[PDB]
RNA sequence: CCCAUAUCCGCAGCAGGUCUCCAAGGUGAACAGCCUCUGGCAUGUUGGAACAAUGUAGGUAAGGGAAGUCGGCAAGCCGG
RNA sequence: UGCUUCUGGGUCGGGGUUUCGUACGUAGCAGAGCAGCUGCUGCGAUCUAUUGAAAGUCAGCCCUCGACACAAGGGUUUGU
């Protein structure tokens, strides 16, 4: 079974969990929960939010 | 062969969905759903893939003030799929149709849910995307 | 006059006396009819509702739109450690019913089952069967026992067996076991009886009773909800906003001249804690308990042919409000009745399952062991550590 | 053995969870007085006014989540009453409740 | 001496009624609303434990948006 | 439903989980700038590092076998 990846956070979405948003111009996004989905719909930037994956990647944290 | 599964219908009778094809119609006032028996004090309710009777409220005047068939191609309410997904679109939209299924228009602006493509071939042909 | 528009009745009259159930453990009101052809077996068991989770299996049903397409589908775990047989009981068919003719108990009985007798195990002297036990170790008693066996063989028609649970093998709080008469179905009474006689004081795992993809019934007490009004009890209409004496009522409870109020009118009262039988639940999987061997224990129950991991069904943080399933368990399709930590009675089906949906074989691809104590996003603690990396607490 | 004292800590956040606003600090005092009644089998309990003020430190709606306390069992003073030993409850200011065990403090 | 949610009139220590004087800080246009100091009080003829229904008074609701109803009553939107 | 099989539950602590989103302090030749003193030193919303940090988490979540105390008891009745 294909495991998707949250379009906002970057975590792994398992078969049962999350949702999908289909915008009027294609561009389907997968979401892990209504925290990601709401930070997306609010038009937040995943790179300025400490817990996302694009943040840890930008600031090179971890390793 | 394959039969339409049930989805979380979310378009009561009175919904004004936008008209996602190039027939010059801008709206679709849903006036009743096809295939609904009913119940005391229970509005009919259409979902993705359900044929309905609608009415163009704004658009070309040769389409207004009359009843039309239509098919809901995108609903905003989150419906579940048997494969364990919950999908929903950015807007409600449907296309106009004749009683045998052929689209009155030519193109479809935007996606078309696979619950509507598996079911209406002449809408999947004029489709732009799927799901 | 007549009702203007037709509406069907609100709620069923077939479950009518909606009262608090008079028993906590579900009662097999009827066992499957026995044929002397089938070999000797049992007809019911006893498990405890752990929790629910997803399942990704490949669907095989030619003609359906999901043929050979993975579908996510909820299941329910019922932890079922093996039952201990502690006595047999025979019945005679009389023109007044089915009278119980004789009961016989085994020599030794656990303190688990002996707790079921006393309403207070703390103030008691624990004397149950203390004089009965001295029948299994002397000719004066052994003779009488063999008599009481050749009698049940001569007369009894139905043979049931008494089998209690093992309550120490569970993560619950109560130590007092649950007893139950499981009817032995099979051959002639002589062979049905010299079977249970061998199994006195023995353990019966679920493999001996239920298989896989086997449709069964679940008998148990609905989860209780208290003194609920008529809108919650019978799901009647809610009156409009301008109603003076409250709006979550039934406006008319009867005509004039039927000068009572009838038994089919929706009225407020107890809701939940009823006794329900829910039929046609498919056994997706009879998992296996933990076990030590070569010092290392094997816990991987939720690993499938496709997953190939080392995770048990236990979600991250254990099942909520229940604990850790470390025993055998069955995986039933879909919800079952009751609440968590509730003893369900799993009964063999009373019908002849001849249907593609009943005879479908099951092959799970993936079992979901994320946490249920919130929107958990990690299957295993290993996968979580290997994703988050090292934290500050290290 | 009969006159003993020892420090505890009381997770008020769980002994109070659920009660309404205007009755939290009160239920927290009734639950301190009952806690000391359990840990020391004396019906006479006596809550110091510093522990009172420390429970009502924030307000009536926001009682501290834990609290470090010093239960001291004492001989009944004048007016020998049906009780022979009473339990004085005393506050203990603490900067963190991490790895704080029940300590058997002595004189 | 009281001059009013207990000294007056309403049968009463009655949520009603009954004529005036003085009039701080912050916010703000403001004697508006909200917090505070001087001064006053102990919740308005009782407490404890529970947290069912039905109420009373506030709230929030996916999708739809008056299809409800005699009627957009009520609520909501708007607000400087 | 539990209430001495050196055990048993209870409180506290610890671990798992999980929710929100990176604590106080300190460091900074990061900061629109401004001022004083002849580069230095101050004011300065915000930023970065320490920091997926801090905080909470069963009262109706899961595991402890970590400390502490406790638990062999009380009252009323019942006979073929
Ligand atoms: Mg009607
Ligand atoms: Mg009729
Ligand atoms: Mg009225
Ligand atoms: Mg949950
Ligand atoms: Mg009050
Ligand atoms: Mg008064
Ligand atoms: Mg009072
Ligand atoms: Mg709404
Ligand atoms: Mg909404
Ligand atoms: Mg109307
Ligand atoms: Mg009408
Ligand atoms: Mg109005």
From Swiss-Prot, chain A:
It is found in: Cytoplasm. Mono-ADP-ribosylation at Glu-4 by PARP16 inhibits polysome assembly and mRNA loading, thereby inhibiting protein translation. It comes from the Eukaryota. There is a cross-link at residues 2, 27, 35 (Glycyl lysine isopeptide (Lys-Gly) (interchain with G-Cter in SUMO2)). Component of the large ribosomal subunit. The ribosome is a large ribonucleoprotein complex responsible for the synthesis of proteins in the cell. Belongs to the eukaryotic ribosomal protein eL24 family. Component of the large ribosomal subunit. This is Large ribosomal subunit protein eL24. The chain holds residues 1 to 63 of 157 of the full protein.
Swiss-Prot record, chain B:
The modification Phosphotyrosine is found at residue 29. One of its GO terms (cellular component) is cytosolic large ribosomal subunit. Keywords: Cytoplasm, Phosphoprotein, Ribonucleoprotein, Ribosomal protein. The modification Phosphoserine is found at residue 8. One of its GO terms (molecular function) is structural constituent of ribosome. InterPro entries: Ribosomal_uL14, Ribosomal_uL14_CS, Ribosomal_uL14_sf. GO terms for biological process: translation. CDD domains: Ribosomal_uL14. The keyword Repressor does not apply. The keyword Plastid does not apply. It is found in: Cytoplasm. Component of the large ribosomal subunit. The ribosome is a large ribonucleoprotein complex responsible for the synthesis of proteins in the cell. PANTHER family: 50S/60S RIBOSOMAL PROTEIN L14/L23, LARGE RIBOSOMAL SUBUNIT PROTEIN UL14. Belongs to the universal ribosomal protein uL14 family. Component of the large ribosomal subunit. This is Large ribosomal subunit protein uL14. It comes from Oryctolagus cuniculus. The lineage of its organism: Eukaryota, Metazoa, Chordata, Craniata, Vertebrata. The gene is RPL23.
UniProtKB/Swiss-Prot annotation, chain C:
Residues 17-30 have a biased composition (Basic residues). Constitutively monomethylated at His-244 by METTL18. Methylation at His-244 regulates translation elongation by slowing ribosome traversal on tyrosine codons: slower elongation provides enough time for proper folding of synthesized proteins and prevents cellular aggregation of tyrosine-rich proteins. It is not required for incorporation of RPL3 into ribosomes. The keyword Ribonucleoprotein applies. The modification N6-acetyllysine is found at residues 135, 285, 293, 365, 372. One of its GO terms (molecular function) is structural constituent of ribosome. Component of the large ribosomal subunit. The ribosome is a large ribonucleoprotein complex responsible for the synthesis of proteins in the cell. This is Large ribosomal subunit protein uL3. It comes from Oryctolagus cuniculus. The lineage of its organism: Eukaryota, Metazoa, Chordata, Craniata, Vertebrata.
UniProtKB/Swiss-Prot annotation, chain D:
The modification Phosphoserine is found at residue 81. Its main location: cytoplasm. It is found in: Cytoplasm. The modification N6-acetyllysine is found at residue 58. InterPro entries: Ribosomal_eL31, Ribosomal_eL31_CS, Ribosomal_eL31_dom_sf. GO terms for molecular function: structural constituent of ribosome. The keyword ATP-binding does not apply. Keywords: Acetylation, Cytoplasm, Phosphoprotein, Ribonucleoprotein, Ribosomal protein. The keyword Phosphoprotein applies. The modification N6-succinyllysine is found at residues 38, 53, 58. One of its GO terms (biological process) is cytoplasmic translation. One of its GO terms (cellular component) is cytosolic large ribosomal subunit. SUPFAM superfamilies: Ribosomal protein L31e (SSF54575). Component of the large ribosomal subunit. The ribosome is a large ribonucleoprotein complex responsible for the synthesis of proteins in the cell. PANTHER family: 60S RIBOSOMAL PROTEIN L31 (PTHR10956:SF0). Belongs to the eukaryotic ribosomal protein eL31 family. Component of the large ribosomal subunit. This is Large ribosomal subunit protein eL31. It comes from Oryctolagus cuniculus. The gene is RPL31.
């Amino acid at each position: 079974m294909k495991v998707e990846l949250c379009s906002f956070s970057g975590y792994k979405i398992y078969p049962g969990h999350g949702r999908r948003y289909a915008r009027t111009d294609g561009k389907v996004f997968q979401f892990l929960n209504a925290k990601c989905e709401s930070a997306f719909l609010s038009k937040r930037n995943p790179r300025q939010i400490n817990w996302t994956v694009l943040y840890r990647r930008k600031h090179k944290k971890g390793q | 062969s394959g039969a339409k599964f049930r989805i979380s219908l979310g378009l009561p009778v009175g919904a004004v969905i936008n008209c996602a094809d190039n027939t010059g119609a801008k709206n679709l006032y849903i006036i009743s759903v096809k295939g609904i028996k009913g119940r005391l004090n229970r509005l009919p309710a259409a979902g993705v893939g359900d044929m309905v009777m609608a009415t163009v409220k704004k658009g070309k005047p040769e389409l207004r003030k009359k009843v039309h068939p239509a098919v809901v191609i995108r609903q905003r309410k989150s419906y579940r799929r048997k494969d364990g997904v919950f999908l929903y679109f950015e807007d409600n939209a449907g296309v106009i149709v004749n009683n045998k299924g052929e689209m009155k228009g030519s193109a479809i602006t935007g996606p078309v849910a696979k619950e509507c493509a598996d079911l209406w071939p002449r809408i999947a042909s004029n489709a732009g995307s799927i799901a | 006059s007549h009702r203007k528009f037709s509406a069907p009745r609100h709620g069923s009259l077939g479950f009518l006396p909606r009262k608090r159930s008079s028993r906590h453990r579900g009662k097999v009101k009827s066992f499957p009819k026995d044929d002397p052809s089938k070999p000797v077996h049992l007809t019911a068991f006893l498990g405890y509702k752990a929790g629910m989770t997803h399942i990704v299996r490949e669907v095989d049903r030619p003609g359906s739109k999901v043929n050979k397409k993975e579908v996510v589908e909820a299941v329910t775990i019922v932890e079922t450690p093996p039952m201990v047989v502690v006595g047999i009981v025979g019945y005679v068919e009389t023109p007044r019913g089915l009278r119980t003719f004789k009961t016989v108990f085994a020599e030794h009985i656990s303190d688990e089952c002996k707790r079921r007798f006393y309403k207070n195990w703390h103030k008691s002297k624990k004397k149950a069967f203390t004089k009965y036990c001295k029948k299994w170790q002397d000719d004066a008693g052994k003779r009488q026992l063999d008599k009481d066996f050749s009698s049940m063989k001569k007369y009894c028609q139905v043979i049931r067996v008494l089998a209690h649970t093992q309550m120490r093998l569970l993560p619950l709080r109560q130590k007092k076991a649950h007893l139950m008469e499981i009817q032995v179905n099979g051959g002639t009474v002589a062979e049905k009886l010299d079977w249970a006689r061998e199994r006195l004081e023995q353990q019966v795992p679920v493999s001996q009773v239920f298989g896989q993809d086997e449709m069964i019934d679940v008998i148990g007490v609905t989860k209780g909800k208290g003194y609920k009004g008529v809108t919650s009890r019978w799901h009647t209409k809610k009156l409009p906003r301008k109603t003076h004496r409250g709006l979550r009522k039934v406006a008319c409870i009867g005509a004039w001249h039927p000068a009572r109020v009838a038994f089919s009118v929706a009225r407020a009262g107890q809701k939940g804690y009823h006794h329900r039988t829910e039929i046609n639940k498919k056994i997706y999987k009879i998992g296996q308990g933990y076990l030590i061997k070569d010092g290392k224990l094997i816990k991987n129950n939720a690993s499938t042919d496709y997953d190939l991991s080392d995770k048990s069904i236990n979600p991250l943080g254990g099942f909520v409000h229940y604990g850790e399933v470390t025993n055998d368990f069955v995986m039933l399709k879909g919800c079952v009745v009751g609440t968590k930590k509730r003893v369900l009675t799993l009964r063999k089906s009373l019908l002849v399952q001849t249907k593609r949906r009943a005879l479908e074989k099951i092959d799970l691809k993936f079992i979901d062991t994320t946490s249920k104590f919130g929107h958990g996003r990690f299957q295993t603690v290993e996968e979580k550590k290997a994703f988050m990396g090292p934290l500050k607490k290290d | 053995n009969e006159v003993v004292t020892r420090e505890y800590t009381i997770n008020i956040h769980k002994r109070i969870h659920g009660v309404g606003f205007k009755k939290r600090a009160p239920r927290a005092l009734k639950e301190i007085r009952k806690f000391a009644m359990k840990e020391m089998g004396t019906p006479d309990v006596r809550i110091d006014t510093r522990l009172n003020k420390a429970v009502w430190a924030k307000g009536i709606r926001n009682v501290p989540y834990r609290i470090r306390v010093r239960l001291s069992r004492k001989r009944n003073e004048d007016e020998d009453s049906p009780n022979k030993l009473y339990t004085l409850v005393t506050y203990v200011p603490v900067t963190t409740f991490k790895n704080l065990q029940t300590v058997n403090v002595d004189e």
